[PDB]
């Protein structure tokens, strides 16, 4: 919704080669990202988007907060998929991006795609869940990596981040079978999100 | 990407430019300033003329998490040619006090820019040493004969000066 | 479609490989084609000698080329066709898959937008060189190896997989010539860089351990004896009758013991005739080792010939010849006095490090540190008035 800066975490993994979403999950993310950018822009023109990845041996800033849709897209061609995502750093890298923005009038928000069973420790990320809300960052976990037969670390994180605050975390679970990733996010709330001051 | 490397000659301007840049970002007190480093490369002695600051954030609990504005650099290079059209990207300076093991990950990102293997020029900001208060390293990837896999590791290059007539006087 | 082929191949296969067959079927259905790839790796590691392998890979390569991990896919085949015994067949099959890849990267490289397929072309190209080497065509292999060599060096970061395949061509090629010193250096590079997932077997690894040891015993500028003892392949392979006497010969050399060397070689020279047709290197090596060793560990860089006579247990005629030969080899450098009966050295060839040797050099620095330190104090006390 309005009055928001957005860090999109795109998951670069080899679990994004699963053709559970046609054709492949990575290429489904290519369409999805472009929409999410446009949607936030027409709601309120102070919304800008930055892009980070999981890619590398350590995640990386590919795009700083920018008003250009084409730089986000360009960032997607740049990043490789042999890389692999680790949650613990990806959360922290994103907060650093939220400290350098084009519009310091907006508020701080993360949207995170997960295509991977995250083998990172649950207990570790629970400390980081409590870091975000002190920095006044919310994270939305778009989850379809851990419905692949792993336990849900995510349930715990979403509850911990939630606190009376206008930035509110939201949990989406998406059906793994074919419906076209971009469609499932588009038809579900991405601008009907509401605050909890 | 050239492996053409033997030495590093350093303009006095670089050392000084990087000393102020560290304190004007105000990433100091065990927080690093990392900027781009500009000069000639693709020759045995790497000739370093100039440096600029880059916006940078250093998580001090985890030096393995940082902020680097990738876009900006492309913007900056266009301005570097105005100054001198032999300035091109050749690396990034570190502000000491010495080499670290968080430097390899930062080095990665700097491979999308340089036509030479990214230089790490440690500008000591305290002025320690028995020669020039600089060390120089470059990242080279090489097999190890001990029995372990291919690592990327920093080999030292000597530090030296040479200077233009205008600069020296 | 492919499902019926899996079930008939599952039936024929081993009990060990039956549970791995079930998993390809389940994962195909569930559309999680990445965990599909991991099961295949474990299958291809221990399917080296069963016939099921060629058919299984032929099924999957057709359907997925970039919807599984490309590097592994090619690596399987290289191993598939080394274990084959029909080489005119292997050569076709590789060539046909190469053709497909060159067509493939026109559509798919841009469609995916972050996956190249050109690393796969190089991976096939390495094996076609080795195929010529199995047929005893050394020239053709070299023409493919020169192309691989240029590409590899341009890269400033290397995949382990490609440079492993690069070294594999070289090592088989040098030993057809029977070049010990060339073969040895190559094989060190190959073991060091090895992949996390080995399609390289322990049988080949035990062979490589044997070849290296022949090269060292039969070498003349190889003083890497402790390097073998400081690399897992030879120091952990001590386990068979064949590698017990052999391991001892490499230890005998390092300490410089001549009586044990002789006792083992008397047993073994009969049993294996390869030692019986290169004996000259073999018995001379232990004399050279002791010769380079002595000069290095002493502060002085000159030895009497009487000191050489004792230590290598040779006549005074051959003590002089041993020095000549060493310098020709370029292990020691200097000048020879026959008329002060000295050898005066100016160069030692770098050789092994060992706990022992580490300490020997340390001491020399303390002693030289004392010479520096006390002098600077003489000079400080002198000309005190003038330090401006």
UniProtKB/Swiss-Prot annotation, chain A:
UniProt PTM: Ubiquitinated, leading to its degradation. Ubiquitination is promoted by HUL5.
Protein species of origin: Saccharomyces cerevisiae (strain ATCC 204508 / S288c)
Disruption phenotype: Cells are viable.
A molecular function (GO) term: polyubiquitin modification-dependent protein binding
GO biological process, one term: ubiquitin-dependent protein catabolic process
Key words of the record: Proteasome, Ubl conjugation
Tagged with keyword Ubl conjugation: yes
GO CC annotations on file: cytosol; nucleus; proteasome complex; proteasome regulatory particle, base subcomplex
Further information: Present with 17200 molecules/cell in log phase SD medium.
Positions spanned in the full protein: 1 to 197 of 268
Assembly and binders: The 26S proteasome is composed of a core protease, known as the 20S proteasome, capped at one or both ends by the 19S regulatory complex (RC). The RC is composed of at least 18 different subunits in two subcomplexes, the base and the lid, which form the portions proximal and distal to the 20S proteolytic core, respectively.
Keyword Ubl conjugation in record: yes
The protein's name in its UniProt record: 26S proteasome regulatory subunit RPN10
Family: Belongs to the proteasome subunit S5A family.
Role of this protein: Multiubiquitin binding protein.
Domain VWFA: 5-190
Swiss-Prot record, chain B:
Keyword Acetylation: yes
Post-translational modification: N-acetylated by NAT1.
Keyword line: Acetylation, Phosphoprotein, Proteasome
Domain MPN span(s) in chain numbering: 8-143
Gene Ontology CC annotations of this record: proteasome complex; proteasome regulatory particle, lid subcomplex; proteasome storage granule
Biological-process GO terms, alphabetical: proteasome-mediated ubiquitin-dependent protein catabolic process; ubiquitin-dependent protein catabolic process
Entry keyword annotation includes Glycosyltransferase: no
Any one GO molecular function term: metallopeptidase activity
N-acetylserine: modified positions: 2
Signal peptide: none
Function field: Acts as a regulatory subunit of the 26S proteasome which is involved in the ATP-dependent degradation of ubiquitinated proteins.
Note: Present with 19800 molecules/cell in log phase SD medium.
Family affiliation: Belongs to the peptidase M67A family.
Name this polypeptide is given: 26S proteasome regulatory subunit RPN8
Organism of provenance: Saccharomyces cerevisiae (strain ATCC 204508 / S288c) (Baker's yeast)
Protein encoded by which gene: RPN8
Parent-protein residues present: 1 to 169 of 338
From Swiss-Prot, chain C:
Domain called PCI: residue spans: 182-350
Cell inner membrane among keywords: no
Gene Ontology CC terms, in alphabetical order: cytosol; nucleus; proteasome complex; proteasome regulatory particle, lid subcomplex; proteasome storage granule
Molecular function (Gene Ontology), one example: structural molecule activity
Keywords annotated in UniProt: Proteasome
One annotated GO biological process: proteasome assembly
Pfam families referenced in this protein's UniProt entry, alphabetically: PCI (PF01399), PSD13_N (PF22037), Rpn9_C (PF18261)
Domain of life: Eukaryota
PROSITE patterns in UniProt: PCI (PS50250)
Chain's role: Acts as a regulatory subunit of the 26S proteasome which is involved in the ATP-dependent degradation of ubiquitinated proteins.
Note: Present with 12400 molecules/cell in log phase SD medium.
Similarity comment text for this entry: Belongs to the proteasome subunit S11 family.
This protein's name: 26S proteasome regulatory subunit RPN9
Organismal lineage: Eukaryota, Fungi, Dikarya, Ascomycota, Saccharomycotina
């Amino acid at each position: 919704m309005v009055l928001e800066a957005t860090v999109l975490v795109i998951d670069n993994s080899e679990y994004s080669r699963n053709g559970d979403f046609p054709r492949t999950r990575f290429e489904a993310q290519i369409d999805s990202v472009e929409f999410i950018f446009q949607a936030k822009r027409n709601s309120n023109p102070e919304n800008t988007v930055g892009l980070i990845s999981g890619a590398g041996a350590n995640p990386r800033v590919l795009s700083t907060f920018t008003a250009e849709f084409g730089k986000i897209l360009a960032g997607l061609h740049d990043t490789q998929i042999e890389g692999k995502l680790h949650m613990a750093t990806a959360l922290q890298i994103a907060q650093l991006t939220l400290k350098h923005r084009q519009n310091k009038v907006q508020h701080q928000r993360i949207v995170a795609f997960v295509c991977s069973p995250i083998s990172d420790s649950r207990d570790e990320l629970i400390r980081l869940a409590k870091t975000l809300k002190k920095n006044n960052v919310a994270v939305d976990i778009i989850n379809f990596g851990e419905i692949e037969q792993n336990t849900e670390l995510l349930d715990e994180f979403i509850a911990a981040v939630n606190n009376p605050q206008e930035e509110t975390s939201h949990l989406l679970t998406v059906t793994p079978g074919p419906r076209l990733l971009y469609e499932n996010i588009a038809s579900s709330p991405i601008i009907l999100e509401e605050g909890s001051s | 990407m050239s492996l053409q490397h033997e030495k590093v000659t350093i303009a006095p301007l670089v050392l000084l430019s990087a000393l102020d840049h560290y304190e004007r970002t105000q990433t100091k007190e065990n927080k690093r300033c990392v900027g781009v480093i500009l000069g000639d490369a693709n020759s045995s002695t790497i000739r370093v003329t100039n440096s600029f600051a880059l916006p940078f954030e250093e998580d001090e609990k985890n030096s393995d998490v940082w902020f680097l504005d990738h876009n900006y650099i492309e913007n900056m290079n266009e301005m570097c040619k105005k100054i001198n059209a032999k300035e091109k990207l050749i690396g990034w300076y570190h502000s000491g006090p010495k080499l670290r093991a968080s430097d390899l990950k930062i080095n990665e990102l700097f491979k999308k820019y340089t036509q030479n293997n990214p230089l790490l020029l440690i500008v000591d900001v305290k002025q320690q040493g028995v020669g020039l208060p600089t060390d120089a390293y470059v990242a080279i990837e090489q097999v190890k004969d001990d029995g372990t896999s291919t690592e990327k590791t920093f080999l030292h290059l000597p530090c030296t000066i040479e200077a233009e007539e205008a600069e020296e006087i | 479609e492919i499902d019926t082929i899996l079930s008939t191949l599952r039936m024929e296969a081993d009990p060990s490989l039956h549970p791995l067959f079930e998993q390809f079927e389940k994962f195909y259905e569930e559309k999680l084609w990445f965990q599909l790839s991991e099961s295949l790796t474990k299958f291809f590691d221990d399917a080296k000698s069963t016939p099921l392998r060629l058919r299984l890979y032929d099924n999957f390569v057709s359907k997925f080329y970039d919807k599984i991990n490309q590097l592994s896919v090619v690596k399987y085949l290289l191993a598939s066709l080394k274990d084959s015994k029909d080489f005119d067949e292997s050569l076709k099959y590789l060539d046909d898959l190469k053709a497909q890849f060159q067509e493939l990267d026109s559509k798919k490289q841009r469609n995916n937008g972050s996956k190249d397929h050109g690393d796969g072309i190089l991976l096939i190209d390495s094996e076609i060189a080795r195929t010529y080497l199995l047929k005893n065509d050394l020239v053709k292999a070299r023409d493919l190896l020169d192309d691989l060599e240029k590409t590899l060096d341009k890269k400033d970061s290397i995949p382990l997989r490609i440079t492993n395949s690069f070294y594999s061509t070289n090592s088989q090629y040098f030993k057809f010539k029977n070049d010990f010193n060339s073969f040895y250096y190559t094989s060190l590079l190959y073991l060091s860089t090895l992949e996390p997932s080995t399609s390289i077997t322990l049988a080949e690894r035990q062979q490589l351990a044997y070849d290296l040891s022949i090269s060292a015993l039969l070498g003349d500028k190889i003083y890497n004896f402790g390097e073998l003892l400081h690399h897992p392949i030879m120091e952990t392979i001590v386990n068979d009758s064949n590698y017990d006497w052999l391991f001892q010969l490499l230890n005998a050399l390092t300490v410089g013991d001549f009586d044990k060397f002789d006792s083992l070689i008397k047993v073994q020279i009969s049993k294996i005739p390869i030692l019986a047709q290169h004996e000259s290197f073999l018995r001379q090596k232990i004399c050279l080792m002791t010769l380079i060793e002595t000069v290095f560990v002493k502060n002085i860089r000159m030895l009497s010939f009487e000191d050489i006579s004792k230590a290598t247990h040779l006549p005074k005629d051959n003590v002089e010849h041993l020095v000549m030969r060493a310098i020709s080899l370029g292990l020691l450098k200097g000048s020879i006095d026959q008329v002060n009966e000295l050898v005066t050295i100016s160069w030692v060839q770098p050789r092994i490090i060992s706990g022992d040797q580490i300490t020997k050099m340390k001491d020399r620095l303390v002693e030289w540190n004392d010479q520096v330190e006390k002098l600077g104090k003489k000079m400080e006390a002198r000309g005190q008035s003038i330090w401006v």
